[PDB]
Design a protein around this ligand. Structure first.
Ligand code: HEM
Ligand code: HEM
Ligand SMILES: C[C@H](O)[C@H](O)[C@H]1CNc2nc(N)[nH]c(=O)c2N1
Ligand SMILES: C[C@H](O)[C@H](O)[C@H]1CNc2nc(N)[nH]c(=O)c2N1
Ligand SMILES: NC(=[NH2+])NCCC[C@H](N)C(=O)O
Ligand SMILES: NC(=[NH2+])NCCC[C@H](N)C(=O)O
Lengths: 362, 362
């Protein structure tokens, strides 16, 4: 009964994949081998070409992603060969190193062995390979609240954070057959961070803000032709607003707008002064300026939206249906200044794609 | 077959209305009289209490409206007695005068006779009672492009605009039985306008921007218990962003962001400078400052969202389901700074409500 779902998704995927690669004639024979493989083993194994293209298709189908113009240049790393936690660890270290690329970020995915009987071979606990810890204890708020539960979970495993506002969480994942995950401290040499300064307001440094260079989502499931890659961390480069308008701005995150208003020399007393709006703009300018000055890749929301429009045009020219989530595609500052705001998007789910998974902690 | 739809909507409305007014015991007898009235005449007539409460309920059900906290203080003007175009004209003039209230704006609706056999007694062509004309002719762009088609239609009726960027369109409506609408020039004494200045950037006046005080939507259908009030203009006061982030900012509208960037002394060369975002903030600050200085009612998007949150809480306490359109409720600047951005809204349609109608021009 499980073969049936796998087999149908496999047919849809290979037919569409090989079609796009111009391998339309090799479908029938490839489908046969897969049909046999499923019969024998209860599953099938992707060729490196299918795996690579499937990961690209999945990115192209990510309704919430504004950066999809570059779907076809994704660097896919096939690590389905890993069997030990040392190999997982070094694969994760390598992903960080190669995707970072000394600041000139390469969009990269590292693909680990897929679920077998729904049984995970590797289970990554981190939301992102690089992220800051969070602590709350009796009035105290330190670090990133979005990381509070994972941080508490790590401190159940013998790890202890310094309790600065920017503790790097260790990598934490569990191997099949083990009851507890293991954790490895990140080598600081691998992690680029960017101190946030303002182009012309020098007092901005007094906030002592910083953020990490590369956002590497590590807790989503990649689904390709019925195959479930629960462990397949991926990264692009940041859009400035993700850091300046959300991570550093949200009240449930770092909540820095009042402090920003102070250092840029404006009052934070009256809603009608639009001080939050003004602080958001200056904070987002500082973020863009800082990453650029540091030689770390980043994109502003206007350029990103322009690129996304080219993605829309490209899709129309190629005869492909466009899907998107309007509510996530619009940037959280000046959304009406982008074309995205003024059109509609079909939020249908197309596979291959990336999906949410339940968290092993909490 | 038309009695059936009317009768069912009537039952739902009166039962719910009288329930809310505490007139639950008078439902059965009122429903009887209506049932007879429909049988005899093919329609029924609302009491002043039902009409008033129905208009309020309709506002409360307006999924796109962030200002719904004040639904119950709506000033309803019953003008179902009008029969002549002079009476319509004077009713419209009065609505403008009383809603304006010397700048301290009163949320007001004037209700004209409803459709009979789907036949309109009064058909208002204006989108808003007060709005600026728009012209495009061989390269020329003057005024408000959103008004181009209506403006062209008026100039087919013997009206001629001065072709400034802020020509007030005449009132234009058609009476039942007439083939063409009539138009009446607005008395300037009735129309408050606000010149846009900046609190601390005096060069902002060089843009010579202004906007009108009161937004009075005049082309939507009010539906109450099966009765279709196609002509029922209503107004609240502005939220600043409607003017500063859309009317004056959109490229398909007044398109003023480059000129704003110039007068506030910033470059408009690089996306990464976030000059559009900065210009939007300063333009929206100027709008709020200008209306306040002029003694004309206005609300900023932060205060408006706070009020809307109270509307959410009030709804929960009263046992009423909340409905809303997330995509319209979020303000077009700093939406993530409002609570609205971070929750979901059921976009179901509940009646009574206000609906779109096809435009007689275009
Ligand atoms: C190349 C630069 C990229 C940019 C600028 C970009 C931009 C964005 C942004 C701004 C978001 C919203 C994130 C949030 O609000 O938290 C997003 C979401 C997303 N992006 Fe991209 N992205 C990029 C690359 C990629 C890559 C390489 C993949 C995967 C192969 C990807 C898949 C996704 C997915 C799955 C989401 C949704 C995540 C979620 O639901 O939480 N993107 N992207
Ligand atoms: C009291 C002050 C009010 C404020 C601040 C307010 C705020 C708003 C705003 C900002 C919008 C979005 C408009 C746009 O983007 O073009 C809106 C839409 C709307 N409001 Fe209100 N509103 C108010 C009063 C009213 C009143 C009195 C009514 C009717 C009785 C009403 C019914 C609506 C409707 C029907 C829409 C949707 C219009 C459309 O779909 O184009 N509002 N409101
Ligand atoms: C396509 C999209 O639904 C459309 O542009 C909407 C988005 N949200 C909006 N929200 C408001 N308040 N006003 C608008 O005109 C719009 N436009
Ligand atoms: C409730 C709402 O859907 C939710 O807050 C969404 C809105 N749009 C978003 N858009 C982006 N890019 N990121 C987010 O986290 C969210 N949050
Ligand atoms: N550009 C991206 N790939 N973003 C992925 C999500 C990152 C997340 N929003 C963050 O601020 O850390
Ligand atoms: N606050 C209101 N009632 N707004 C109604 C819509 C007005 C319209 N958005 C305008 O800018 O003219």
């Amino acid at each position: 009964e499980e073969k049936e779902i796998l087999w149908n998704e496999a047919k849809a995927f290979i037919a569409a994949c090989y079609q796009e690669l111009g391998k339309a004639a090799e479908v029938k024979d490839r489908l046969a081998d897969i049909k046999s493989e499923i019969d024998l083993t209860g599953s099938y194994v992707h060729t490196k070409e299918e795996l690579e293209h499937g990961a690209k298709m999945a990115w192209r189908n990510s309704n919430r992603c504004i950066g999809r113009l570059f779907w076809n240049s994704l660097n896919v790393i096939d690590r389905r060969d890993v069997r030990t936690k040392e190999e997982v660890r070094d694969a994760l270290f390598h992903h960080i190193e190669t995707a970072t690329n000394n600041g000139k970020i390469r969009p990269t995915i590292t693909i680990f062995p897929p679920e077998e009987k729904g049984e995970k071979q590797v289970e990554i606990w981190n939301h992102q390979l690089i992220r800051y810890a969070g602590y709350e204890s009796d009035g105290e708020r330190i670090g990133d609240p979005a990381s509070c539960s994972l941080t508490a979970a790590c401190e159940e495993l013998g790890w202890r954070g310094e309790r600065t506002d920017f503790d790097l969480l260790p990598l934490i994942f569990r191997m099949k057959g083990d009851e507890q995950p293991v954790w490895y401290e990140l080598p600081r040499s691998l992690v680029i961070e960017v101190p946030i300064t303002h182009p012309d307001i020098e007092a901005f440094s007094d906030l002592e803000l910083k953020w990490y260079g590369v956002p590497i989502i590590s807790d989503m499931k990649l689904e390709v032709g019925g195959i479930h890659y629960n462990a397949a961390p991926f990264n692009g480069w940041y859009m400035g607003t993700e850091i300046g308008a959300r991570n550093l701005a949200d009240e449930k995150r770092y909540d820095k707008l009042k402090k920003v208003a102070s250092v840029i020399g404006i009052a934070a007393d009256y809603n009608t002064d639009l001080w939050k709006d003004q602080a958001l703009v200056e904070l987002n300018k500082a973020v863009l300026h800082s990453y650029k000055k540091q030689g770390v890749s980043i994109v502003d929301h206007h350029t990103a939206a322009s690129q996304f429009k080219r993605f829309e045009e490209q899709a129309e020219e190629a005869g492909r249906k466009l899907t998107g989530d309007w509510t996530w595609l619009i940037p959280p500052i000046s959304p009406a200044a982008t074309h995205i705001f003024h059109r509609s998007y079909d939020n249908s789910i197309v596979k291959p794609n990336y999906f949410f998974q339940d968290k092993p902690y909490e």
